[PDB]
DNA sequence: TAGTTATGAAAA
DNA sequence: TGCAGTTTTCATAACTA
DNA sequence: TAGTTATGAAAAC
DNA sequence: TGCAGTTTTCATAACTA
DNA sequence: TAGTTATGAAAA
DNA sequence: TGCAGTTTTCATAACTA
DNA sequence: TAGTTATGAAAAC
DNA sequence: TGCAGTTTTCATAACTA
């Protein structure tokens, strides 16, 4: 049902009221695939109704995110920062226009990345669009903000579109060698090296590699076909030559038998559960450091960008890049064409004539 | 004039029916009329939509409009009339809540209707119903206005519509077999030359069905063994496609001789015995007949499936999606990707980049 | 100064009132370079003020167009057709929305080309945008139509963007031969053949060729540089090998001495004035007919499209096409890339493998 | 809050001054702050624009903002303050007509101001003044609102702004001479290695001035004799450019050794003796010094002129405007065309298409 | 035969 | 990641000079 | 003959 | 980066000392 | 020297 | 044909540890 | 040791 | 054809039988 735009005497509390509604609305629409316990999310749902303060909204949203409802983080923090802006420094909610929002973005996201700025703007757009569709007074009249925020700097594409940090061909080989060269304890060496090499050789995402199942591995003519579970019982596939991981895979599978592994996980901690992104990052980063390859990004996804880049350099096949990386949009795949050596060569070689 | 108060009738059902008619009429003036032969048929539909005060009238007139060439009206008419049926039935059967006034029509109500009337339908069809509903209430929001110049705001924004299937294209080998089957399958002497030329042109160019059926001889330009064909495409988008002459030279000359005995109209390349353009129904049955004969039946079995096959082969040989985009007449890579199918086995081309 | 939106009791006359203002406004802003007598235009200016009927507006606009104010034709006829639509079949000007305009476009432009439809729409957009900026009542309040007409079919680019009718390489040669092969009287043969060949060899526009001056011809190393006067004392240049027109040029220049030529015109009628587009068209068309090359377009501009096309086929230089044809926008030059044989070949030749 | 009635002050001059301040303040929050070192300087400007009630204050604060990194504010400030001067002077000197109330500010008035204050200015500058004025009254139209929620509408839409000059680029031969002059001209041992490397990189890549001055060593990647350079460009647009190593290898190694003696900050490739990035002023004077020495002075004599020279040469060798578009970091062919200059003599390449 | 309308559905 | 929304074909049923 | 003016329509900038 | 907006030709009628 | 701010103007 | 409008460089003047 | 959870921030879809 | 909008990782803190 719709509520009047101004139900409370205090516009600050009234703003908090609409934010709580919007956040609860998003909690029901956003993906809950990473949610381990749906009961916790169900608790968060009604808690967003009984929440009457900024601290409570933040507390619940953190609880929901930590439960597996990850998407809520992109909306919660920015909007609650706006409530702080609106509360500190204005009699009505109608005073809120794009000019006020511009001032808010400047003050709160001024020292933040352009990508973060966009997240704040998108969060604002969603909130006031939600308000525009859910408000209606006793006189059956609705107030329409119609906020679009088009005049804000660095909000469109190509603005702050930082080309993905990655390794080239030579740097990748040095990283591969560094995996086997860096020291690791006997308890984790086989598992960790296998995990990171699979990521390097496939461009697999972090959570994709961490949730890999053994039954999804198929070996045919020296080639592994690895199935990766996606959204809604959907599977995507990647391929990997056996000789890259063959001896290392067998070594880990033997050790794995001494682990209390659950749910047919290929990789797991000592408790048998899937490894975290935190552990995977630190294991990847220390190798990056050891290889003297430290840069703007030093995680597993940086390796993912490296594979995509290498693949285009070697094949110049846009769709092959899409299908291998698992891109839903060719816009994403087209990003890696910006590193096309053969294309860059055409321009740089004009001086040789 | 074109603006009316939201509720003019005591009957919300009749009033909802009223707005639907107004919206569909607006669409008959705003949607493409390129396929319309006689514009007078459109004007008749425009007037008949005004005098319409029932569901049967609206359906008959919109069908009349579609059959006259205004093809786009078919996507809006039926879904809205099904909602009017839903609203009308609910108001009579369930005397409660929203169905007492169209002011109480909201997102929850539209969601239930889509859940009831689009049960065993594809996601694409469900998407069509949704877009239709959104358009109707967008029109009402813009066009409703009382005596005091005050309007009611719906602001309805429905959320997006969230096993493996058979192939929707012929691969390289299957394409070769289809081409052979075109010649191998039996056709009467009266139609064999014309029909073979028609289908083959479609195969080698990726031409849409209507684009092929409306080919004029003046659309062809021969130079150094190459036919440059000008195509008035979907949405009246023009593009040029090339067809090597050796693919159709003997077949074209054979049909053109037969064509002299036809009372051809509008300089059409292909025509029936009456001289008029062939229909999609005939083309489909002719194509499916060959597909079935070659044992190549799959998810789609029409000329459009051959269009998929063309784009897939084109990218397979050139690895250039822009080139596909040019040949098919698209504006973006995403749309061309729909026709460009990727064989999963080609993933080993990605796995082998490390060995080089 | 601004006027109230509704100054008259009759909305029909009030609409006619705004149209007359808009047309007069355009007559002052539109280019008057083709105007032979500025006095006639000055007369049309005040006549648009004293005009109190549709017939008078049409009469004046025709007068203005025939005087050299060509651009007025694109606005006059469509808007007066709208007044007819509004008068026939509504108490106020406020009733006019994009829904009414959609009905008007369907009824009046239904049997017309998509390009003509766009001209009607553009004319409407200008009128109601002009009204939005020039209306204000006694209460200092303005009514804003804000008409954009985005939901109308075939209004954007790529919609009805008919690829320019033209001749290919072989057809061009046959046309060139046909110029010398077709029969012409001794009084006009040298002049006409020279005129048409210059157009063919340069892709020059009709009015460009008709207004050519002798002083703008420069011969250097067997190559003619021809200057073409553009807008505001601006000149563009084309080049032409002498051997194409050398003997034919000298022949006409001798005959030209028996003409009372004015203003250093290269081509002229018997009265010494510049030839018309009408005469040039008929002379070009009859050759097209004679060559068996008749098609969708059979004028001098069709030859212009042919040159642009041939130039790209031979050079594949987009900027060269722009500079040779005199395009202000590369959007125009890029049109001829759609006929790129080498590009089309890449797709058609997939069956040969 | 951000909305105020159109006329709050009895003095229309003070009131016009008031709206200008509000508009410029909004621009300080909406324009790019990527060049701003200390964001606190921006916040100071924001507060000082509120307490400002005069022209001198607005100018000082906007200058302070520009000098702090908010470069875009310079295009709006001066033209509007010149209009405020025009309005203020006219109201005092000519006690008549529009200058009694800012409600009477219209198109005719703005046209006269542009005619008076932009006499001896370029068309581009005139265009800047126009855009500034349009932005101001667009802001006022959106932000004015009385106690009765009623607003005044300006709806001001100014019409567009309607001998031969010296070259604005170096051709192929001149480029070669410039490169020679870089080495031939005399520089002190302290700056010769650094300055030569800087300018040469600009020449061979078409890099913008600030893009070059802000180069980090981590931006360079060497592979098979090729340097791939990542550039954070204008409008924070990222692009990669390639530079063959043999052009700068000996010069780069020479400077890097000197660089070890510098207190370099932020891993900058080029820096002054303080370790901070070099200024556009220094770069310009260094470039113009070489140009003048080579006798190549023309319409433009800065590093941007070299950027023109790069694009012109690039298209001359490749005939690919998209390639130019990629190297320069543009979104359209029209913008790249600005840098791509066409030699009129090449028209004979068009005249010779008939002879083939 | 040799094709045509008409149409709810499914894309493009 | 996937729409905005207009404009086509699918895939038959029913029919005939 | 050898051209013109006038014009709705259709582009071409 | 497409658009709104401006400028020109199409293509034929109806002439004419 | 070896560079820096500051700035009205002119583009991009 | 050429903008919408934000974000840069031009091209000096004036100055100095 | 060998990993975890929590988190503002920054992307990556 | 860019977007609004959704989903995921970065990268570090603070732990701990
Ligand atoms: Cl993606
Ligand atoms: Cl152009």
Q: What is the 3-state secondary structure (H, E, C) of chain B?
A: CCCECCCCCCCHHHHHHHHHHHHHHHHHHHCCCCCCCCHHHHHHHHHHHHCCCCHHHHHHHHHHHHHHCCHHHHHHHHHHHHHHHHHHHHHHHCCCHHHHCHHHCCHHHHHHHHHHHCCCCCHHHHHHHHHHHHHHHHHHHHHECCCCCCCCCCCCCCCCCCCCCCCCCCCHHHHHHHHHHHHHCCCCCCCHHHHHHHHHHHHHHCCCHHHHHCCEHHHEEEECCEEEEEEECHHHCEEEEEEEHHHCHHHHHHHHHHHCCCCCCCCECCCCCCCCCCCHHHHHHHHHHHHHHCCCCCCCCCHHHHHHHHHHHHHHHHCCHHHHHHHHCCCCHHHHHCCCCCCHHHHHHHHCCCCC
CA separation for the pair B269, D351 (Å, rounded): 38
Interface contact B318-C346, CB threshold 8 A: yes
Q: Which residues contact residue C33 at a Cβ distance below 8 angstroms, ignoring those fewer than 6 apart?
A: C68, C231
Tokens matching residue C39: 């006095």
Q: Which among D221, D267, D271 has a CA at the least distance from the CA of D243? A: D221
Instruction: Chain C: list its partners (3+ Cβ pairs within 8 Å).
Output: B, D
Would you state the torsion angle of the CA atoms of residues B2, B4, B9, B11, taken in this order, to the nearest 10 degrees? 80
Contact D63, D31 (CB under 8 A): no
Rounded (10°) angle between helices A300-315 and A277-290: 70
Residue C248: which H helix or E strand, with range? helix C246-256
- Picking from B17, B19, B10, B14, the residue whose alpha carbon sits closest to that of residue B152 is B19
- A82 interaction partners in chain D (CB closer than 8 Å): none
The DSSP result for D289-342, as a single string, is: HHHHHTT---S--SHHHHHHHHHHHHHHHH--HHHHHHHHT-SSHHHHHTT---
Among partner residues B46, B218, B323, which is closest to C347 by beta-carbon distance?
B323
**Cβ A311 vs Cβ A319: under 8 Å:** no
CB contact under 8 A, C347 and B326: yes
- Token representation of residue D177: 């001479």
Find, among D57, D96, D312, D291, the residue nearest to D180 by Cα: D291
The three-class DSSP label of residue C265 is strand
Pick from D340, D348, D352: which is nearest to C319 by CB? D340
After which residues, if any, is chain B broken (C to N > 2.5 Å)?
162
**Cα dihedral angle (C203, C204, C205, C209), rounded to 10 degrees?**
-140
Measured CA to CA, the distance from residue A199 to residue A210 in angstroms comes to: 10
- Say if strands D220-223 and D226-232 run parallel, antiparallel, or are unpaired: antiparallel
Q: Would you call A262 a catalytic residue per the annotation? A: no
List the resolution, Å: 2.4
Give all strands of the β-sheet with A217-220 in edge-to-edge order: A217-220, A223-229, A235-241
Contact A142 B159 (CB under 8 A): no
List C-alpha distances in Å: D354 to A297, C63, C206, C327, D348.
57, 43, 21, 21, 11
Strands (DSSP E) contained in chain D are 220-223, 226-232, 238-244
Ligand 2 center from residue C334 Cα (angstroms): 10
> What is the number of other CB atoms lying within 10 angstroms of the CB of residue A55?
10
Q: For chain K, which bases have at least one atom within 7 A of a protein Cβ?
A: 1-13
End-to-end CA distance of chain A: 72
Backbone angles phi, psi at B261, to 5 degrees: -90, -5
Residues 6+ apart with CB under 8 A from D45: D28, D61, D62, D64, D65, D68, D70
For residue B101 the two structure tokens come to: 């006034």
Round to whole Å and give the CA distance between D350 and C310.
Answer: 10
A185 C-beta neighbours (distance < 10 Å), count: 7
Count of other CB atoms within 10 angstroms of residue A38: 12
CA distance A134 to A114: 30
Give the C-alpha separation, C129 to C153, whole Å. Answer: 21
Residue whose entry in the numeric block shows the structure tokens 């007359």? C20
Pull the structure tokens for residue B112: 């239930």
Q: How far apart are CA D65 and CA C222, in angstroms?
A: 61
* φ, ψ (nearest 5 deg) of residue A189: -65, -50
Angle of helix C54-67 relative to helix C11-29, nearest 10 degrees? 10
The answer to whether D41 touches D69, Cβ cutoff 8 Å, is yes
| HSE of A7, CA atoms in CB hemisphere, 13 A | 16
Nearest CA in chain A to B106: A1
Measure CA A161 to chain center: 16
Q: Give the distance, in angstroms, between the CA of residue B173 and the centroid of all CA atoms in the same chain.
A: 29
Element (H, E) at C255: helix C246-256
Q: What one-character-per-residue DSSP string does A200-243 give? A: HHH---HHHHHT-BGGGEEEETTEEEEEEE-SSS-EEEEEEEGG
C-beta of residue B212 within 8 angstroms of C-beta of residue B307: no
Instruction: Name the method of structure determination.
Output: X-ray
Rounded CA gap, B142 and B132, in Å? 16
Chain B: give the shortest CA distance to residue A317, in Å: 6
Main-chain dihedrals φ then ψ at residue D295, nearest 5 degrees:
65, 40
* Whole-number Å distance between alpha carbons of C58 and C62: 6
How many C-beta atoms lie closer than 10 Å to residue A226's C-beta? 22
How far apart CA D287 and CA C115 sit, in angstroms, is 52
In angstroms and rounded to an integer, the radius of gyration of the C-alpha atoms of chain B is: 25
Residue A70 to residue A76: CA distance in whole angstroms: 11
Q: How far apart are CA C241 and CA B12, in angstroms?
A: 78
Question: Which helix H or strand E contains A3, and what residues bound it?
Answer: none
Q: Are D228 and D327 in contact (CB under 8 A)?
A: no
Contacts of C315 in chain D (CB under 8 A): 349-350, 353
Distance of alpha carbon A299 from alpha carbon A208, whole angstroms: 14
Q: What is the DSSP letter of A164?
A: P
Write down the catalytic residue from C193, C301, C305, C312. C301
Integer Cα distance of A282 and A298 in angstroms: 9
For C97, which of B2, B31, B317 is closest by C-beta distance?
A: B2
- Residue B219: half-sphere exposure toward Cβ, Cα within 13 Å: 24
Residue B347 sits at the chain A interface (C-beta within 8 Å): yes
Is C327 designated active site? Answer: yes
Ligand 1 center from residue A327 Cα (angstroms): 4
Residues of chain B neighbouring A140 (CB-CB closer than 8 A):
103, 152
- Cα dihedral B284, B289, B292, B294 sign: negative
CB atoms within 10 A of CB A250: 11
Q: Collapse the DSSP code of D174 into the 3-class scheme (helix H, G, I; strand E, B; otherwise coil) and give the result.
A: helix
Task: Determine how many CB atoms are found less than 10 A away from the CB of residue B343.
Answer: 11
What number of residues does chain B have?
A: 356
E-state strands within chain C: 217-220, 223-229, 235-241
- In sequence order, which ranges of A35-91 are alpha helices (DSSP H)? 38-47, 54-67, 73-88
The residue with tokens 């995110």 is A65
Name the 3-class secondary structure at D188.
coil
> Chain B contact for C337, CB < 8 A?
no
Closest CA to C121 of C96, C90, C153, C89: C153
Backbone angles phi, psi at D296, to 5 degrees: -115, 15
Long-range contacts at D285-289 (CB < 8 A, ≥ 24 apart): D286/D195, D286/D198, D286/D199, D287/D199, D287/D202, D289/D185
Tell me which of A126, A237, A324 to substitute to probe the interface with B (most B C-beta atoms closer than 10 Å): A324
Residues of C in contact with D157 (CB under 8 A): 133
**Alpha-carbon span C163 to C338, nearest angstrom:** 8
Round to a whole number and report the distance in Å from the CA of A166 to the C1' of L3: 26
A301 is catalytic: yes
Maximum CA extent, chain C: 77
User: Which residue is listed with tokens 């059902």?
Assistant: B13
Contact D318 A346 (CB under 8 A): yes
* 3-state DSSP assignment of residue C235: strand
Contact criterion met (CB below 8 Å) for C293 and C306 = no
């Amino acid at each position: 049902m719709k509520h009047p735009l101004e139900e409370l005497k205090d516009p600050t509390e009234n703003l908090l009221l609409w934010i709580g509604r919007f956040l609860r609305y998003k909690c029901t629409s956003l993906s809950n695939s990473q949610v381990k316990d749906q009961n916790k999310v169900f608790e968060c749902l009604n808690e967003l109704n009984q929440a009457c303060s900024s601290s409570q909204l933040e507390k619940v949203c953190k609880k929901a995110r930590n439960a597996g409802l990850l998407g809520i983080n992109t909306y919660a923090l920015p909007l609650l920062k706006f409530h702080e802006y609106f509360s500190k420094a204005f009699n009505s909610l109608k005073n809120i226009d794009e000019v006020m929002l511009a001032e808010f973005l400047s003050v709160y996201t001024g020292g933040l990345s352009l990508a973060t700025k966009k997240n704040y703007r998108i969060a604002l757009l969603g909130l006031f669009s939600y308000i525009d569709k859910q408000n209606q007074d006793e006189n059956e009249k609705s107030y329409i903000y119609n906020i679009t925020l088009k005049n804000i700097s660095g909000v469109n594409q190509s603005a702050g579109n930082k080309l993905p940090t990655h390794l080239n061909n030579e740097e990748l080989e040095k990283f591969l060698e560094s995996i086997d060269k860096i020291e690791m304890s006997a308890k984790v060496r086989a598992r960790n090296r296998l995990l990171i090499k699979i990521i390097v050789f496939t461009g697999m995402r972090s959570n994709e590699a961490l949730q890999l199942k053994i039954k999804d591995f198929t070996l045919e003519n020296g080639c592994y076909t690895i199935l990766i579970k996606g959204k809604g019982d959907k599977y995507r596939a990647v391929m990997l030559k056996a000789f890259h991981i063959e001896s290392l895979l067998k070594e880990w599978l033997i050790e794995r038998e001494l682990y209390p592994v659950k749910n047919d996980l290929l990789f797991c901690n000592q408790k048998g559960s899937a490894l975290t992104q935190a552990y995977l990052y630190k294991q990847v980063e220390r190798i990056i450091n050891f290889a003297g390859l430290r840069r703007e990004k030093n995680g597993a996804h940086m390796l993912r960008h490296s594979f995509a880049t290498l693949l285009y350099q070697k094949r110049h096949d846009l769709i092959l890049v899409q299908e291998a990386l698992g891109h839903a949009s060719l816009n994403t795949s087209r990003i890696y064409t910006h590193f096309d050596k053969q294309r860059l060569e055409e321009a740089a070689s004009i001086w040789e004539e």
